[PDB]
Design a protein around this ligand. Structure first.
Ligand SMILES: COc1ccc([C@@H]2C(C#N)=C(N)OC3=C2C(=O)C[C@@H](c2cccc4ccccc24)C3)cc1
Ligand SMILES: COc1ccc([C@@H]2C(C#N)=C(N)OC3=C2C(=O)C[C@@H](c2cccc4ccccc24)C3)cc1
Ligand SMILES: COc1ccc([C@@H]2C(C#N)=C(N)OC3=C2C(=O)C[C@@H](c2cccc4ccccc24)C3)cc1
Ligand SMILES: N[C@@H](CC(=O)O)C(=O)O
Ligand SMILES: N[C@@H](CC(=O)O)C(=O)O
Ligand SMILES: N[C@@H](CC(=O)O)C(=O)O
Ligand SMILES: [Ba+2]
Ligand SMILES: [Ba+2]
Ligand SMILES: [Ba+2]
Ligand code: NA
Ligand code: NA
Ligand code: NA
Ligand code: NA
Ligand code: NA
Ligand code: NA
Lengths: 404, 404, 404
């Protein structure tokens, strides 16, 4: 293959086709250079916000499109499938989600054992958010007992849109108008992400430039720990089921992985991960609208590995019970939101379970932002390969719907 | 009939059909037992909230479904009827609402005469809420001058949805798409209340268990006062108009009356009262979507009797003007919200009208919760019998629509 | 013409046809009389709010209908036009908007030369509001860095609805359902403004009555300055393009100009300006839904003249750089909101540009309310004549759509 590469054949065709994909890679390279060049800070945090503003605009655009996407996706997705067909596709997703989150936490504990307001209120608020008291409120607000904190209730909307799509599925002819209504809205918001995809290189540049303006050994532990899980463990899972090339599939969702390294939000990168699967990897719309929104807030393999490493790292300094780490890190992974720094916020639960003090989180916070950008990528990669595996396992159910 | 009852015939068929209805009755019996058994409180109010949490979840589910129900109901209801046909059905509802609220206040004053920030701002805020400045805000917020307090503006949504449904009625063919849109959404949210109906026994149990964790004579006055109005006065009104058995009709809405005793909210129990009339009592959808949402926030016969008893009870301790009590108690009844403890909040208006001090409300508050659960039932019973009476009086208008 | 007027012919026919238009003129005459008669104030501002309450209700009704109008208008408007056809109609609107705002600021500076938290944060917040992070939030909230202040994000909704309508235009057949959905909603909210049009005389009366309960020379400068621009400059622009009578056109939108003098909000008067053009002046719905919502928040000729006069008036007391006044007054005109007193709030930007102190705004505030009612009229007049000019310039594009 090395001798085959020195041919220097068709380089112009690659630059013309992957123009936007190369620009985002160029944005990361220029974003690290520009940020480190302007690293001596004679500027107030107020002036840092002005500097990272072109990246802040991209976030506003992405955060905008999440709500009409999540809602339209599940309502059409759960209506496109039959009562038993949705349960089978669901069980395939649940089995995949639980396995990948438990294998990540096992890899996380092994790698850290080789290389050296209440907790109950955090559980009740999750159950309170799964059942929102007002849907209009849920679209822009979340519950946090002291009462209703700012920011979208993604979980409550996924749960409602699921049941709502299933109810229209039972309605048939009457329910067809609303299913056709939400299918128009999904394609309408998808045609809107295509426009936002061109602003992305300008945004990502200033988004990472503004953020670069014993713990060192720990940083390597997670970063190395994620490379093993994401580039060796997860691609082999795809090859074992689909029997197809995983690194060719990972290349299609590169624009979704590069944006994750910028935003650090599974929810914010979801409208682009939808565009990456449905277009370049030619994944079925009926399953992307099924696996992708659920995996965004639940399938967090990168967080579960981070929750296992950072918890034991706290015990290393402070100087059976390791089984409860693998349980609560899996529990906090599914719980945690697909938004930035939501990895350390849910670490309160994993530390209290073993008896470790929660005041130790302050030590990690400083380097969190860099690991957050890497863990989001593993969370995006999980749903992306997660859709492809479900599609390959449910082609029989998909062929029955194509009859008409 | 006593000799006819000792037959012991078909007991298995009753347990299999009314399985869910018996479970809610069992939930009330178990809810009183469990609450009184755990009555010695070595637990903080924080721990009481944890105990009544399975009941708190049911409330979140019910409060959720009120907004898409109220909106879809009136828009289709006012569009299903003609310009003059809606005015006639309206006049039948208004006449029924005013009569039942004035007869309840007359029964209330008689029973209490036998057995021993500004008021203007409370009126202006009602007129401010009837015309909401922002519909999206109205869906989760209400006005309260100091500015816009938390909680749905049910009145503003009923008023807007009414006019909006009437405007589509005039639009005909163009307006048919939106009428067909909202009819899908109404049946979609109705299929969602069927699912919530199974959680109800688990909720109601902890909802009443958590709440049980001269004023004594007063408690009997209202409780006895409501039994006369609800079980003797109101069923005879149905028999005088429909010429049909009222206690057989009351049995159909038992799941709506039992839930009222738990939630204490006419709005929260409205999605279940809709399911009780449309199914078991086979009431027309065109009139339930017309009488039920309006009666939920206006027809409060149980509150009007409570407002008459509690006002004179305050004068009994403190030691012509009784005509103003019957007027303001009727005025506060129509005003007051279909939510818990909204009976004492509107008592400020009835006490200031006669000159009695508003600081006397503090005496009643302690026992209010128990009477609140009983008065809600009389408010639910009023709309339920209220729909059946309107349906019986408007069959000619209903037969004209069935031609097509 | 003077001899032709003494005929006293058909006076009964004018009172029967323009009954509502004469009532609003009568409301202004009675509103000035009633307000000045009750001018000796032995009443607290709390009692002033009670007095101006019948005008406050009209505002609640108007503010209500703006959000479903703005959203439905642009989505159908941008879908009714072709990709290149919307760009041409857009360029015609942009050219008209920039010319009228630059000619108003030139007239403003001439008339004042004959007759004697940060500024950057105000720019960033505009760019933050053009891209809203949550559409449900945008419908009732706006951004203001300290974080998200109360009141509708009109600009974010106009920008989203524009792109959304354009995306459905590309969708064709699939996108037709949603275009037909939003066309029903536009006509539904238009049939709702017809009802609010009858409350208008009662509202306008108390709206202006409550508001009348060197700076004197300055007041005349702007008032005279607006009469030249609005009644002499702007009608001649219409006559130069359309070749039709402008004062006959101004008569059709009189109910929209009289309401502006009451509300002082281009957004609040927009649902009535829509009813005035589409009915009395028989303007095409495809262009009113295009020019009117954009012009409401951008085309502010009355504000640009006010921003030029009041800035130089501040320099007159305090005792090349005049070019920056004409630039920033145009910049603040497009920026400023179509709501009351938004003329002095954006004056911070025009005063800082030349070096003048922002603390001088306190001097003008006292008389602002009267000039605000007059400048809103010039902003309403600008969009109204602005639609008629675009319609006359784009009849070829309109005739192609009428083929079907
Ligand atoms: C709590 O966190 C979740 C929510 C969802 C899921 C699965 C999933 C994915 N991915 C999607 N899109 O739909 C369904 C799933 C089911 O397991 C069940 C499946 C289902 C099948 C049949 C009837 C249903 C009725 C209502 C809701 C879901 C239903 C839907 C997994 C965990
Ligand atoms: C203020 O508190 C209320 C609101 C509503 C009602 C009545 C009602 C009930 N129940 C329902 N569903 O609709 C109408 C009612 C009318 O009286 C009038 C009726 C009506 C008839 C004809 C045209 C209308 C146009 C707009 C609104 C209502 C209209 C509608 C009574 C009191
Ligand atoms: C920033 O403040 C504004 C926003 C809008 C406008 C113009 C306008 C008016 N009036 C309306 N109704 O639509 C469009 C305009 C364009 O210039 C462009 C035009 C347009 C043409 C072709 C494709 C488009 C795609 C997305 C958005 C607008 C598009 C739409 C002017 C200034
Ligand atoms: N940043 C992660 C969540 C986390 O903070 O753990 C994501 O968005 O996927
Ligand atoms: N609880 C009553 C209202 C009240 O408190 O008076 C209801 O919801 O019907
Ligand atoms: N009152 C003006 C805006 C301003 O205050 O300048 C309008 O609504 O058009
Ligand atoms: Ba089907
Ligand atoms: Ba019809
Ligand atoms: Ba077309
Ligand atoms: Na997983
Ligand atoms: Na998660
Ligand atoms: Na009544
Ligand atoms: Na009421
Ligand atoms: Na202009
Ligand atoms: Na403006």
């Amino acid at each position: 293959k090395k001798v085959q590469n020195i041919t220097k054949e068709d380089v112009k065709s690659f630059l013309r086709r992957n123009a936007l994909l190369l620009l985002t890679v160029l944005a990361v390279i220029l974003g690290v250079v520009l940020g480190f060049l302007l690293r001596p800070y004679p500027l107030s945090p107020r002036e840092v916000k002005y500097f990272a503003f072109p990246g802040e605009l991209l976030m506003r655009m992405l955060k905008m499109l999440i709500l009409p996407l999540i809602v339209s996706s599940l309502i059409t997705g759960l209506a496109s499938l039959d009562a038993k067909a949705s349960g089978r596709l669901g069980m395939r997703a649940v089995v995949y989600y639980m396995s990948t989150t438990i294998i990540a936490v096992v890899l996380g504990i092994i790698l850290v054992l080789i290389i050296h307001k209440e907790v109950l209120d955090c559980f009740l608020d999750l159950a309170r958010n799964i059942f929102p008291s007002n849907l209009v409120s849920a679209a822009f607000r979340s519950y946090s007992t002291t009462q209703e904190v700012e920011g979208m209730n993604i979980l409550g909307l996924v749960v409602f849109s699921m049941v709502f799509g299933f109810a229209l599925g039972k309605m048939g002819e009457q329910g067809q108008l609303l299913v056709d209504f939400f299918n128009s809205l999904n394609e309408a918001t998808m045609k809107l992400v295509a426009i936002i995809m061109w602003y992305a290189p300008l945004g990502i540049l200033f988004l990472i430039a503004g953020k670069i303006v014993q713990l060192g050994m720990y940083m390597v532990t997670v970063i190395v720990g994620l490379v093993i899980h994401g580039l060796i463990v997860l691609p082999l899972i795809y090859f074992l089921i689909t029997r197809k090339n995983p690194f060719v599939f990972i290349a299609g969702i590169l624009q979704a992985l590069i944006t994750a390294l910028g935003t650090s939000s599974s929810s914010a990168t979801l409208p682009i991960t939808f565009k990456c699967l449905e277009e370049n990897n030619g994944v079925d719309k009926r399953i992307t609208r099924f696996v992708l929104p659920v995996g965004a807030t639940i399938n967090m393999d990168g967080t579960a590995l981070y929750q296992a490493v950072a918890a034991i790292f706290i015990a290393q300094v402070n100087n059976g019970q390791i089984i409860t780490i693998s349980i609560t890190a899996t529990a906090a992974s599914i719980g945690a939101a697909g938004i930035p720094q939501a990895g350390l916020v849910t670490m309160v639960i994993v530390l209290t379970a073993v008896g470790l003090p929660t005041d130790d989180i302050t030590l990690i916070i400083a380097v969190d932002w860099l690991l957050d950008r890497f863990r989001t990528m593993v969370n995006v990669l999980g749903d992306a390969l997660g859709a492809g595996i479900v599609e390959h396992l449910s082609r029989k159910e998909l062929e029955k719907q194509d009859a008409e």
